[PDB]
UniProtKB/Swiss-Prot annotation, chain A:
Organism (species): Saccharomyces cerevisiae (strain ATCC 204508 / S288c)
Modified residues annotated as Phosphoserine in this record: S592
Biological function: ATP-dependent DNA translocase. Component of the general transcription and DNA repair factor IIH (TFIIH) core complex. When complexed to CDK-activating kinase (CAK), involved in RNA transcription by RNA polymerase II. May have 3'-5' helicase activity alone, the TFIIH core however has no 3'-5' helicase activity. Also involved in transcription-coupled nucleotide excision repair (NER) of damaged DNA. In NER, TFIIH acts by opening DNA around the lesion to allow the excision of the damaged oligonucleotide and its replacement by a new DNA fragment.
Family, similarity comment: Belongs to the helicase family. RAD25/XPB subfamily.
GO CC, alphabetical: cytosol; nucleotide-excision repair factor 3 complex; nucleus; transcription factor TFIIH core complex; transcription factor TFIIH holo complex; transcription preinitiation complex
UniProt note: pH dependence: Optimum pH is 7.25 for helicase and ATPase activities.
Motif position, DEAH box: 328-331
Stretches assigned to the Helicase ATP-binding domain: 213-375
Protein name: General transcription and DNA repair factor IIH helicase/translocase subunit XPB/SSL2
Subunit details: Component of the 7-subunit TFIIH core complex composed of XPB/SSL2, XPD/RAD3, SSL1, TFB1, TFB2, TFB4 and TFB5, which is active in NER. The core complex associates with the 3-subunit CTD-kinase module TFIIK composed of CCL1, KIN28 and TFB3 to form the 10-subunit holoenzyme (holo-TFIIH) active in transcription. An additionnal subunit, TFB6, plays a role in the dissociation of the SSL2 helicase from TFIIH after transcription initiation. Interacts directly with TFB6.
Outcome, altering E329Q: Loss of DNA translocase function of TFHII
EC number(s) on file: 5.6.2.4
Domain Helicase C-terminal: 429-583
Curated annotation (Swiss-Prot), chain B:
Pfam families listed in its UniProt record: Tfb5 (PF06331)
Location of the protein in the cell: Nucleus
Subunit structure: Component of the 7-subunit TFIIH core complex composed of XPB/SSL2, XPD/RAD3, SSL1, TFB1, TFB2, TFB4 and TFB5, which is active in NER. The core complex associates with the 3-subunit CTD-kinase module TFIIK composed of CCL1, KIN28 and TFB3 to form the 10-subunit holoenzyme (holo-TFIIH) active in transcription. An additionnal subunit, TFB6, plays a role in the dissociation of the SSL2 helicase from TFIIH after transcription initiation. Interacts with TFB2.
Superkingdom assignment: Eukaryota
Name of this protein: General transcription and DNA repair factor IIH subunit TFB5
Gene3D superfamilies listed in its UniProt record: TFB5-like (3.30.70.1220)
Length: 615, 65
């Protein structure tokens, strides 16, 4: 920026004007725009070299928003740390960026890249006989690391529990650690003979992710992000089958574990004898030399109370030196104590699988030193238009609260108004009309409701079953089987239990009457249930996702706060002010003011052996 | 035969209830209640109630950044 006259509108852009630079003669071909200050990258997806840049930008820069036409990525320290590991240097990155960038790279951007791209590849964490050794191929690194306050071909032991501390210290210091597993030369760990049967198929994006993971040929450790229903189970099975080493899978549910195992056996040639399921019901482990242990975070992170059989299982897990760990729904590992399992459990390779790499607190960044960087991400609309996933007409219904309940809304405290604006009659009436219309349309409907009282009230009012925490496994399985294969039943009322990690090929329509506040991750996880509909490829099909919200309430605040991730992905919600033909339905719930008053009062009122014979 | 200067506020039951709460805390706000959708208010307080009602409603609206 030298001898560049500002424009009269330059004031409106506070240090954001980028007109001080000139455009290259080949702008018509170069598709990239680079932000010299915020690090945001604008990608033209409708110009030559767009495909060549779409993957490199994903590798070096995190995606902010990727709508239909113009893609938006961003370069950050974590993204550069992830990129520098897979055979990528500043020289190559700058060469490609200059060849694809309409504008020259600024010296500030060059300095920022150089500062962070030259501090990797000097330390390696290895494990030998259940002992963690921080081996470094160079000795001169000692003169600074051992002299640092925290730390302390040469190898020294380190406490297993102190891994979570040493890794974060390594992030703070110049050199971060990389976890590479050369399973080809790893002979100490017994091998497991399981391979993918011919019936298996790998989708193009799955193959691309596997290529990005195994490009160099040595298995690294990290995180994989794919949309719900994309085939994360098959990705994990492929990773296990290609590594061919002892593996432990951690899943945050029991039904999820059951289907995990069922798909595991179906997709690969794993013998039943070599398979073990570690749940609350049965705790037996495979007696073969090598096998797989599928358990849950509750069964791996508990340290105070353990059964006798579960104590033997925990002793087995700790004594044996595992070779691979697969963390399903890894967004919960940075919790207060779930992060402790990473440090305590011994394993040479850690893979995390999650459709969302965000969480409410700031601990999301801790994943970098807990399990590693993110490897691959996949777009939603791209797969929707390519036929890999379904298309959804997301809609937001505005249900006006009636005056009788609103007058109490004004006076009631924060805790009571929550139930008040969730149990408004208008929502009941709209739900009944929509249920009748969609049942005539022959759609399989799921109604989610976090609130157990609201779920029970709706179920008892509509004569339909409800499922929540108190429901037993057998009963809920019976409900699912009948809702699937029985022609009489077409709609069910699920709850927070079935929010994630459940495969419902038949489910097509999704409705939300009660939501768990502003939880953006739960929004996407709930949407994931209907993304694998059986009839998701027939011409003209469009799944439906309804979100009922009361206007002029904080429910609108939370609703607009919980969809900021779907909007970023590309999904757009359509506001439905009115549903046509609602009055013609014969009967509507809570249609009379007398019943409205009765419900108002009800909801407001809601808040010596011989002396043994004596006794 | 009697005329009274004032401002007529036409709205829906919800806005009417909000105005009723505001008047209950400040009696001078609403001069009279005409119907479940109409209220007579003081001319001077119109410019203040509009701004204060916008501030109050800002809570129900999520404005990032
Ligand atoms: N490559 C594939 N070939 C066949 N079916 C696939 C493939 N990828 C995913 N699926 C199907 O997608 C559905 C969801 O798979 P799952 O592993 O449960 O996904 P996730 O764990 O990501 O929710 C299953 O019906 C599975 O068979
Ligand atoms: F993301 Be899946 F539904 F396990
Ligand atoms: Mg899954």
């Amino acid at each position: 920026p030298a001898d560049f006259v500002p424009d009269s509108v330059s004031g409106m852009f506070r240090s954001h004007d980028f007109s001080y630079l000139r455009l290259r003669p080949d702008h018509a071909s170069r598709p990239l725009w680079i932000s010299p200050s915020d690090g945001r990258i604008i990608l033209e997806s409708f110009s030559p070299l767009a495909e060549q840049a779409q993957d490199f930008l994903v590798t070096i820069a995190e995606p902010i928003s990727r709508p239909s036409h113009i893609h938006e990525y961003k370069i950050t320290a974590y993204s550069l740390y992830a990129a520098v590991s897979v055979g990528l240097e500043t020289d190559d990155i700058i060469s490609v960026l200059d060849r694809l960038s309409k504008v020259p790279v600024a010296e500030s951007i060059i300095n920022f890249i150089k500062g962070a791209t030259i501090s990797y590849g000097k330390v390696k964490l290895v494990i030998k006989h259940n002992r963690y050794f921080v081996e470094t191929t160079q000795a001169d690194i000692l003169q600074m690391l051992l002299n640092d306050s925290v730390i302390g071909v040469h190898s020294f032991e380190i406490a297993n529990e102190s891994v979570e501390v040493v890794k974060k210290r390594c992030q703070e210091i110049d050199y971060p650690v990389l976890e590479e597993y050369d399973f080809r030369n790893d002979h100490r760990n017994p091998d497991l003979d399981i391979d993918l049967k011919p019936s298996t198929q790998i989708r193009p994006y799955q193959e691309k992710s596997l290529s990005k993971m195994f490009g160099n040929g040595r298995a690294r450790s990290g995180i994989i992000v794919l949309p719900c229903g994309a085939g994360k189970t098959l990705v994990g099975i492929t990773a296990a089958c290609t590594i061919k080493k002892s593996v432990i899978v951690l899943c945050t549910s029991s039904v999820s574990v059951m289907q995990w195992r069922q798909q595991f056996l179906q997709w690969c040639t794993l013998q039943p004898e070599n398979c073990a399921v570690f749940t609350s019901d049965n705790k037996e482990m495979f007696q073969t030399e090598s096998g797989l242990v599928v358990s849950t975070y509750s069964m791996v992170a508990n340290t105070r109370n353990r059964s006798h059989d579960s104590q033997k299982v925990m002793d087995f897990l700790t004594g044996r030196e595992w070779g691979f760990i697969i963390l399903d729904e890894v967004h919960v590992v940075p919790a207060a104590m779930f992060r402790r399992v990473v440090s305590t459990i011994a394993a040479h390779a850690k893979l995390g699988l999650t459709a969302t790499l965000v969480r409410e607190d700031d601990k999301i960044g801790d994943l970098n030193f807990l399990i590693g960087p993110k490897l691959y991400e996949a777009n939603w609309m791209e797969l929707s238009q390519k036929g890999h996933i379904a298309n959804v007409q997301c809609a937001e219904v505005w249900c006006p609260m009636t005056a009788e309940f609103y007058q109490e809304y004004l006076r009631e405290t924060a805790r009571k108004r929550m139930l008040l604006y969730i149990m408004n009659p208008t929502k009941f009436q709209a739900c009944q009309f929509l249920i009748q219309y969609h049942e005539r349309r022959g759609d399989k409907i799921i109604v989610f409701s976090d609130n157990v009282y609201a779920l029970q009230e709706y179920a008892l009012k509509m004569g339909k079953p409800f499922i929540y925490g108190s429901t037993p496994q057998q009963e809920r399985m019976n409900i699912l089987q009948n809702f699937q294969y029985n022609d009489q039943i077409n709609t069910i009322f699920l709850s927070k239990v079935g929010d994630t990690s459940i495969d419902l090929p038949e489910a097509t329509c999704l409705i939300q009457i009660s939501s768990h506040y502003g939880s953006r991750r739960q929004e996407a996880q709930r949407l994931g249930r209907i993304l694998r509909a059986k009839r998701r490829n027939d011409e003209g099909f469009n799944a439906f996702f309804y979100s009922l919200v009361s206007k002029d309430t904080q429910e609108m605040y939370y609703s607009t706060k919980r969809q900021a991730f779907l909007v970023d992905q590309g999904y757009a919600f359509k506001v439905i002010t009115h549903l046509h033909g609602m009055e013609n339905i014969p009967n509507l719930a809570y249609a009379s003011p007398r019943e409205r008053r009765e419900l108002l009062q009800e909801v407001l009122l809601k808040n010596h052996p011989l002396i043994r014979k004596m006794y | 035969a009697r005329a009274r200067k004032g401002a007529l506020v036409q709205c829906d039951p919800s806005i009417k209830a909000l105005i009723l709460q505001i008047d209950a805390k400040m009696s001078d706000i609403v001069l009279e209640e005409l119907d479940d959708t109409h209220l007579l208010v003081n001319p001077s307080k119109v410019e203040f109630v509009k701004h204060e009602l916008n501030r109050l409603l800002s809570k129900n609206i999520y404005n990032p950044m």
